[PDB]
Amino acid sequence: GDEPEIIAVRRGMFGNRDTGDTSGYGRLVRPVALPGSTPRPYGGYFDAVMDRLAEVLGEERYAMSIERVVVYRDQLTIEVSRVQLPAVASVLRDDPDLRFELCLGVSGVHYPEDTGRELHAVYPLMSITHNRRIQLEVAAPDADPHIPSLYAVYPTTDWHERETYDFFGIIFDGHPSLTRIEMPDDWEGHPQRKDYPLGGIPVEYHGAQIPPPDQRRSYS
Template sequence: MSNTPAPEAAADTSPSAEPAPTLHGHPLTDSFGQPVVHVARSSYIALIKQLANDGYVMAVDLCGVDYLTHPGRTLPEGIAPERFEVVVNLLDIEHRRRLRVRVQIPADDATCPTLFDLHPGTEAMEREAYDMFGISFDNHPDPTRILMPEDWDGHPLRKDYEVGVIPVQFSADYVQNAPRAEETSAWQ
């Protein structure tokens, strides 16, 4: 073993190098066998409409991701990493296909267009992304919290969220001094 880094592979600049794959003009990558399309926030709704025409008519999941502690993640060329990301999983039931859509969301403008008009089932998922990460969805019909109380400060799944101290009901002292089954006649 050596502490010297391995030499980096030279980029293939020959004319025979294939261009990176795209889907409707957006970079297409692969993650563990699942195709992933990366789209700019400004093109998000237009792409979702095109994908619906391609058969991707069911949104099975939508979530937020906070990459505060992973700013150097790998993204396709032309996609700038932002702190937040909205991830949508779509299904084409007829052809048994799944597609993931990733949208970069900047921390200083954590908003994204809503999918509610195209996929009404995303209403609760977008509310959860707002509640947990603070990502708002433009023109959402009910932009309120879904899990936390309305007066809750902050968004608990953000990496910089201050974790408070919550008293634990059962401490190690309680467990050590708890009555044992054999010591209680009611349990026999």
């Protein structure tokens, strides 16, 4: 794809998920789109980093692996295609010009409205040698939440792949042991998924109680 990545479609003015407190304002339809591919002249060293990545990777392989490049707020995010993640990770880590020796972790985020790409894993990579920073974004469907584990390339991803599996169910296949790290192994569900309820209890008060914030109204 080439259009910006719509993650949610909000209907109605005032950011109201429900029908609307006032009649007549619920007809606005605004898709919430995360930024799409950036025009080629990336700012700063991002342009050099992508030039080197496209040089080390073959043109065919580069096209197959890099789904998108997003330069947002002077930060570079390579939407990498799944499956190819280990290859590009190895290239980034090992290549002298890229040399992103320090992978800082793996963060899971869930986009239940993003069809075919509900689960995203974010790999913040830093190159101390060149003092550079990038992020890799890998998308997996909710129905097939598998992603190639970067354990061979970045051992630090262990306990980050485990944590993101625990909180989102992303199956980092190839991981030495993808067991729950935060939740009990007996736990049911993956808490940080949006569909997973907050699980709070009403706050008690003399003569009343306040339900958890997830049950009550909101205007996100």
